[PDB]
Amino acid sequence: IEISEELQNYTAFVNNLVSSGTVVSLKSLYREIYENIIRLRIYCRFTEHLEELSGDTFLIELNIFKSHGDLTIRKIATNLFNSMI
Amino acid sequence: KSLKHEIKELRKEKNDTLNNYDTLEEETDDLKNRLQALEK
Amino acid sequence: MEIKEVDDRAELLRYTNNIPLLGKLVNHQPLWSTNPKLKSFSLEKISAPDQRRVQEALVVKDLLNVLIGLEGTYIRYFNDYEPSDPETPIEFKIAKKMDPSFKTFSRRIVRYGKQYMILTRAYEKWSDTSFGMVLQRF
Amino acid sequence: DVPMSQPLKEQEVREHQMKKERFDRALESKLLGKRHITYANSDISNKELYINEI
Numbered sequence: 001i002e003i004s005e006e007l008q009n010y011t012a013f014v015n016n017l018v019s020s021g022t023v024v025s026l027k028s029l030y031r032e033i034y035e036n037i038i039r040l041r042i043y044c045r046f047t048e049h050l051e052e053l054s055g056d057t058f059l060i061e062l063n064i065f066k067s068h069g070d071l072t073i074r075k076i077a078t079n080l081f082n083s084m085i
Numbered sequence: 086k087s088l089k090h091e092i093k094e095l096r097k098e099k100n101d102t103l104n105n106y107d108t109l110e111e112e113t114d115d116l117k118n119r120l121q122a123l124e125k
Numbered sequence: 126m127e128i129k130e131v132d133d134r135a136e137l138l139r140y141t142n143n144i145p146l147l148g149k150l151v152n153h154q155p156l157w158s159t160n161p162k163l164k165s166f167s168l169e170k171i172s173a174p175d176q177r178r179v180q181e182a183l184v185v186k187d188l189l190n191v192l193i194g195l196e197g198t199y200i201r202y203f204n205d206y207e208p209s210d211p212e213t214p215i216e217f218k219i220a221k222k223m224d225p226s227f228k229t230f231s232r233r234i235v236r237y238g239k240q241y242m243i244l245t246r247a248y249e250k251w252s253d254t255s256f257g258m259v260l261q262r263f
Numbered sequence: 264d265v266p267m268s269q270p271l272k273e274q275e276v277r278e279h280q281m282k283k284e285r286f287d288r289a290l291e292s293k294l295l296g297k298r299h300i301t302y303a304n305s306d307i308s309n310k311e312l313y314i315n316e317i
Binding site (some may be wrong): 254 | 306314
Binding site (some may be wrong): 096104114 | 158167204205207
């Protein structure tokens with residue numbers, strides 16, 4: 001459900017960009033979705049072994065990642081960990 | 086180790102081929118310029 | 126400039142075991158050296174002092190594309206650039222038929238383009254867990 | 264003008280302190296020491312990002 005919430009947030013953001021008419025070049029678009037590409041990278045690397053792991057193993061890995069220096073990775077791990085906890 | 090060896094040999098061949106390509110293109114262009122003068 | 130026909134499929138990477146946490150997950154676009162998508166219009170044909178601004182504009186376009194690591198039509202990665210290998214070296218080679226002032230300015234801007242490539246690769250690498258939260262925050 | 268001697272009270276205090284320090288060092292050495300030296304034999308990895316072969 002957290003993955004789906006992130007996907008829906010990303011869809012909403014992409015549609016606001018597109019229909020906002022404020023993107024005029026591909027460089028500007030790539031600049032706008034830089035952090036959303038980062039967030040999708042995080043959400044797609046965390047859940048690679050989703051079918052092969054258990055909820056408590058996810059909890060341990062997310063506890064390891066909640067101390068990440070990268071504020072975005074730590075935010076994402078904190079949200080996932082909070083839901084699962 | 087064997088896979089890393091093959092990678093190194095293939096990377097070298099690639100670099101030599103690309104360097105040869107540029108040398109050849111320069112010859113090709115000189116010939117084109119001479120020909121354009123001759124066909125003109 | 127006339128189109129060339131090459132296969133350009135943008136897909137995720139198949140094996141992601143040796144990729145950092147924030148490493149790029151797509152594959153690299155076709156390089157100009159192996160798979161050029163345009164026939165390069167040689168710059169010698171706009172070297173006349175009247176067509177100088179046309180070559181200027183083409184070089185400025187190539188420079189705006191190099192500034193984010195993307196090789197241009199007349200400014201390209203050099204021969205030893207291997208995009209799959211992440212520890213590859215990064216330099217740009219500039220069209221030898223370019224106006225020498227444009228070559229000088231283009232080398233100056235290529236410095237910044239290469240710095241951008243290396244710094245992007247650097248934070249991608251340092252996003253791992255084996256690097257510590259100080260390097261991760263950097 | 265002359266090569267006088269070091270202080271006397273300070274000298275004997277130093278001798279007593281050196282006796283005590285030698286005793287304490289021998290006692291520590293007999294207890295395998297309280298400080299030693301190391302090298303790290305193992306590294307972390309994460310089950311979210313696991314590896315086995317190249």
